[PDB]
Design a protein around this nucleic acid. Structure first.
Ligand SMILES: [Mg+2]
Ligand SMILES: [Mg+2]
Ligand SMILES: [Mg+2]
Ligand SMILES: [Mg+2]
Ligand SMILES: [Mg+2]
Ligand SMILES: [Mg+2]
Ligand SMILES: [Mg+2]
Ligand SMILES: [Mg+2]
Ligand SMILES: [Zn+2]
Lengths: 83, 116, 177, 66
RNA sequence: CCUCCUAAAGAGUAACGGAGGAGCACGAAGGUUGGCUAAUCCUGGUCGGACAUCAGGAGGUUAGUGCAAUGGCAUAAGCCA
RNA sequence: ACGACCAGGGCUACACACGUGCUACAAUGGCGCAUACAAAGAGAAGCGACCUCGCGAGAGCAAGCGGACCUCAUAAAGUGCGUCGUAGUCCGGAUUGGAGUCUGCAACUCGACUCCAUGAAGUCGGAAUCGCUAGUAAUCGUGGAUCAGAAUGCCACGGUG
């Protein structure tokens, strides 16, 4: 986990994008690769297509998702079952 | 000898006896005892009722037993609802904290299941 | 008897105020409280049933009836007239006393108690509930008991509607939800 | 009720941590000492705090401050 | 040997006609006095589940009869003491 | 393009089978307080005393020192006193929840460490099978390389024996 004195980590570009979206009021999914980026309060309401390594999967941001990071909601490997 | 809605063994030392409560380990018990003014080595038997009451009060300060359990459940349920990686792991019944699964995950997985 | 006395003066009055009843006899009253221990494990050995009965007696000052199989069923491996459960029906002052105990002591002693089911009324007034542990009653000693067991409480009342019954119970400061 | 088949049933005093004194008829025999009662039990006080759902946004605000 | 149908509304009535049972049981499952009323379903209820035990309603003998079938049976011939 | 650059993912998946290890299953022990005796090493984009703050991991301040000088760095098993009294326990620590620290552009996948909570399996292990003849086996700690960080591995060092 991130050190508290350092503050939370968000990619600059992604932050800028988020800000732009907020300014607009638009509801089009934003395709991003920044899985390591922490979700913010201002990020709520937006859909953001997080890259899973192969494809971009849309994540509708909720109140409970805030403290979390973006990669958590974008499962990377696909396992069904052995038999 | 009932603290936080559960019966507690009398013959055991106070520190260890408190540990019978879901919500307190050793350190917590020690802290409780300090708050009370009661010695660690003394048994639950041969205590004054006032002392016991004080101990109960001290226990009440921490989230213990059923209350704690419910909270724990909620967190898990919350995670499940989220559908985050940890939540996903929980729903599967496999190690959350990034442990290996190829071998040695038998605490989560239970006993070995033969291939049909 | 304290609770009966309370009912006589206050609860009835409250009920009248609420439902706007014409007759004082139209008011609901708790007819009987029925306690039951279903004990399937008795078919293996007789003593367990006896123990259960003793526990029941300790809980409620009456000696229990030992109920028997109405019909034989293979699914549970029992024959007709097999001593399978034990039951106490409480009426009058003793019943009132039991009720007093239940709410003022026993229910409070329930481990992880966050209320009683409000939607548990049969549809015609008569409330029912069940306890997982017999040790919630201060009558049973924690050290003495060998087998953990429980019982079902059934509060039968004169109430025509379930809502009325609920109201009555509330008037007796019944925990609910 | 029947004379001999029934267990002994006599009035006892049930003391508590509240200071509440409760004279009740019971099969216990000896004087009873309680931990909690109906008046004491944290139903009205506890159950508001005991759920503790809260929110994440506020938590985030608290610890980072931007 | 018993029950039903064949059997034609008294009785009886045949066929290598159509269907089923008996070769017992019970010192209470007999006598009597006193009391009681079933199947099944729905709802609620610790473990407890389609199905034990407890409530309450619907239900109205659809149950029961020591066993085949028929005729009976609440005045119960059914179930307790 | 079977060449080159980039971001994200994977090499860490998980019905299962095998190998090599670590930790245990306790009392020749656990826990608590006190207290003794090493060796061998490393260190400048490094080792970092003291003092202050932090339950703690650590943080702040900041000497020293390319080092028989200073630092890592308190050896641990042990010894003495106390406690537990054979229990799935004051054994055992897996797992999970919450709160954190540090490294690093960055710890979701996927780090280590700390605190509080949680307390699985396991009561010496079937057929079978391995190592070791002396300062050896067994057991106890310590250091180094690789390294921003990340060892139960490896290579070393001493203790008891
Ligand atoms: Mg004729
Ligand atoms: Mg004729
Ligand atoms: Mg008669
Ligand atoms: Mg007769
Ligand atoms: Mg590999
Ligand atoms: Mg194996
Ligand atoms: Mg076990
Ligand atoms: Mg290193
Ligand atoms: Zn009280």
């Amino acid at each position: 986990p991130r050190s508290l004195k350092k503050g939370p980590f968000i990619d600059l570009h992604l932050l800028k994008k988020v800000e732009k979206a907020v300014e607009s009021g638009d509801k089009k999914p934003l395709r991003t690769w920044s899985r390591r980026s922490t979700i913010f309060p201002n990020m709520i309401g937006l859909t953001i297509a997080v890259h899973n390594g192969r494809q971009h999967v849309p994540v509708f941001v909720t109140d409970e998702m805030v403290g979390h990071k973006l990669g958590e909601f974008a499962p990377t490997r696909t396992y069904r079952g052995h038999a | 000898a009932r603290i936080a809605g559960i019966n507690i063994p009398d013959h055991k030392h106070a520190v260890i006896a408190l540990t019978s409560i879901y919500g307190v380990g050793k350190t917590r018990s020690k802290a409780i005892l300090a708050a009370a003014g009661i010695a660690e080595d003394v048994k639950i038997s041969e205590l004054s009722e006032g002392q016991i009451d004080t101990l109960r009060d001290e226990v009440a300060k921490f989230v213990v037993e059923g209350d704690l359990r419910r909270e724990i459940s909620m967190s898990i349920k919350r995670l499940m609802d989220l559908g985050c990686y940890r939540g996903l792991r929980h729903r599967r019944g496999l190690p959350v904290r990034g442990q290996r699964t190829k071998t040695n995950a038998r605490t989560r997985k239970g006993p070995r299941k033969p291939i049909k | 008897a304290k609770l009966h006395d309370y009912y006589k003066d206050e609860v009835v009055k409250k009920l009248m105020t609420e439902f706007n009843y014409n007759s004082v006899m139209q008011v609901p009253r708790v007819e009987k409280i029925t306690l039951n221990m279903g004990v399937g494990e008795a078919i293996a050995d007789k003593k367990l049933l006896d123990n259960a009965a003793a526990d029941l007696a300790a809980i409620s000052g009456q000696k229990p009836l030992i109920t028997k199989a109405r019909k034989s069923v293979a699914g549970f491996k029992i024959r007709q007239g097999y001593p399978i459960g034990c039951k106490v029906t409480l009426r009058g002052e003793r019943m009132w006393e039991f009720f007093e105990r239940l709410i003022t002591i026993a229910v409070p002693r329930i481990r992880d108690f966050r209320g009683l089911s409000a939607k548990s009324f049969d549809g015609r007034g008569n409330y029912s509930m069940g306890v997982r542990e017999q040790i919630i009653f201060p009558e049973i000693d924690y050290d003495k008991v060998d087998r953990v067991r429980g019982l079902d409480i059934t509060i039968t009342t004169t109430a025509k509607s379930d809502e009325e019954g609920r109201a009555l119970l509330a008037a007796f400061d019944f925990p609910f939800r | 009720m029947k004379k001999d088949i029934h267990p002994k049933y006599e009035e006892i005093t049930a003391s508590c941590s509240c200071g509440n004194v409760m004279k009740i008829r019971s099969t216990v025999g000896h004087d009873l000492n309680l931990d909690v009662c109906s008046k004491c039990h944290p139903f009205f006080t506890g159950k508001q705090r005991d759920v503790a759902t809260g929110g994440r946004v506020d938590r985030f605000n608290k610890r980072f401050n931007i």
